[PDB]
Symmetry: D3
Subunit: 151 residues, 6 copies
């Protein structure tokens, strides 16, 4: 249960707006642990693979062109219910409908530039991790704070 993992990615707008430290702190200070991270520029190809679910939607091409229009911070966070909470933390899809206190609510204005992405379910989480990370890049260790975060 405390081994659940989710995929979080700071999209290009987030990175180009210098929200890395800020976004990372919301997950770090919560008690979740960073078991994988990397910077990279998705190829339009790769982008389409990540969005394979939306391949036949109007905005599909835009999403792919955008997700590959700049650097991206890919991450994998471990923790109990981290997938669900990662979303609670991220906020509504549209910033204008997210409550202050959530990442999108505090740091973004409109849907098209909603700075971050988080897995929306246990399965997509696994797929998304499998797609952005080679198992060698992932880590396994016990945080010192674990005794007090879960006990």
């Amino acid at each position: 249960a405390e081994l659940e993992r989710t995929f979080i990615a700071i999209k290009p707008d987030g990175v180009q707006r210098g929200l890395i430290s800020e976004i990372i702190s919301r997950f770090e200070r919560k008690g979740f642990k960073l078991v994988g991270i990397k910077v990279l520029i998705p190829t339009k190809q790769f982008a389409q693979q990540h969005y394979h679910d939306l391949k036949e939607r109007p905005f599909f091409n835009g999403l792919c062109d955008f997700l590959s229009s700049g650097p991206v911070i890919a991450m994998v966070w471990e923790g109990e219910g981290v997938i669900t909470y990662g979303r609670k933390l991220i906020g509504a899809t549209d910033p204008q409908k997210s409550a202050p206190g959530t990442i999108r609510g505090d740091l973004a204005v409109v849907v098209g530039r909603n700075i971050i992405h988080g897995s929306d379910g246990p399965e997509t989480a696994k797929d998304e991790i499998k797609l952005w990370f080679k198992p060698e890049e992932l880590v396994s260790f016990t945080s010192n704070s674990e005794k007090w975060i879960y006990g």
Copy 2:
């Protein structure tokens, strides 16, 4: 749409409690842009003009005496849906009923000292701006971050 503007004012209590930087950061870090700002001490007269809508209410006189009991930070923020979000950011009228994460919720205790004011609609927004700022004091420029905030 991305040109909408709202009026935000840090009332005397807010200023006397040193919440300027803090309040400003909630709007700045969101992605909205400061197109007008000034410090000043409203005259009871001016105050009544701003609250003209409440001229025949019990508390009217209190509001006017208070809004002129010290310095005030008047501002105009530009951004898509900034008027509505400016309110979401500000929180409920009564601090005790605002959720943590909102300005009033985090930084104020009771209704009578709810530290800030934001326009509550597209029309009052225009009137309020027209009343606190001479067009010369307002600015127009494109933020560097615009490409990534709206795209």
Copy 3:
């Protein structure tokens, strides 16, 4: 009304995770005032006295063993509606169900390690204060900011 007081305690997990300054700031920056504080390690005995209400529940013993498994920051905050708001600030009992922006929501993961405790009612508040503090340790003064927090 502005004299209401509540009991807030940073449990061992909170202290062992270095959340003192952070937790304290949420109450301080709100406008409430610290009228009593101390550090100490509850004895399993004392713990049972504090949890006397849950003496015949499965988890009772766990709670007592835990509340005495390390240092604790006991506090008493004064302010209008501070009891109720202290809870709003703390968030749901289970971190996973607390909204970002609340202490538990931002800084904790699961129910068993929900880092803090706040009185849940005007009566328990009085009892809890009476139990953790000798009247000599409590203070009475008027904050300079009072004129602007309540007026």
Copy 4:
């Protein structure tokens, strides 16, 4: 003594990089009080009568174009020794040589884009304040925290 005022301006690069809240906080939290503030886009000319003591240098022109390439947050801060501490807060002219903890040392990288400006003396202060603010724009009030700051 505690009525000393200095002029602080956030340069276009500062504003453009959204450092308004951050900068203002360094001053507000110290105890100084904001007695004058406005946002404006300096005219190429205006820029020149600000950097006038440098009209002799080979960068005066470069400076003037930049100080008008975008919005500027002009400010007036009051407090004892504010002019001098204002500079300590800002740090060395060259970010590379500023100490971590100072505005430029933390938020800027090179001299050409040192995001902020602060009067360097009692005189330049007096002038600078008069050059950027009409006396009405400034306010006079005693902060609630004055009794505990001084």
Copy 5:
């Protein structure tokens, strides 16, 4: 070595200006541990046996009245070299002369209201701690983060 303790107190002006969280954070985040804390309003007399080494000076009386003009957050911090670093954290006696990054350099303006106090040596520490805390008020535990701090 890592059991060294120092006495830190937030003066009335500090408390009155709501700097409790801010100050405590500078210490907590460094790695030192809070082993003793209380809030109290020093009696005019109590103030005098604290500033006793200064009963000779012409401000001893002024000091004593002030240290009792309001609430005070008294604290005891433990950690290696805490006494010395505690002072570095606090900064110069005179805020005007403290470096940005230090508690006084960031949150205070003048000497008369330098918001905080920290033991200046191993001895004054020992005494100061005994003068403000009963041995029960202090705690002894090994922080979870000890293994990674030392």
Copy 6:
């Protein structure tokens, strides 16, 4: 000139003490750009070819065991004078001797656990970067804020 890169790594004690966000912010907010980052648990051996210039010292072994006792956040930052300022940001090798405002002065206590590492020169940088990152792992893009930083 503005393509200078340095290697920054958050040591196990740093990661274990949840200072990832804090450290990264000191760099991000300055204007430097994250062009390479990964998390990994160095092998006892790997640790040795990093601290190789110290294989002569009586702590080389101690160092190597530690740099592999837990996860590590390895990073590559780009910006003008980044190598040098990166060090100013980090502060003295010994936390006790670092100034408040620096990463070690604020978040660490002793030399043995100084939570972070930063290349000390242009050469060691070049090597260190090549030792920890495959050229694919690094990225090349011009940040939106480049026009206002330089």
